[PDB]
Amino acid sequence: MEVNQLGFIATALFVLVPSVFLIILYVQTESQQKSS
């Protein structure tokens, strides 16, 4: 159809920026005990 060439870019980001935020603070946590 006739979608907003960037609607996808916004969804993709908005699902990484916020999401990654957690795959960041989480990981640093398990390493609170010299682990991956």
């Binding site: 159809m1 979608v3 609607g7 996808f8 969804t11 993709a12 699902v15």
Partner: peptide, 30 residues
């Protein structure tokens, strides 16, 4: 696209499910 996105955001709700039903950090009784 538009559909490719829809099937993706979805297939991760499926991963996110698998992950919290088997990668549940056991609840500790202390």
């Amino acid at each position: 696209m538009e559909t490719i996105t829809y099937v993706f955001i979805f297939a991760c709700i499926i991963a996110l499910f698998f992950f919290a039903i088997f990668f549940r950090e056991p609840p500790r009784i202390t």
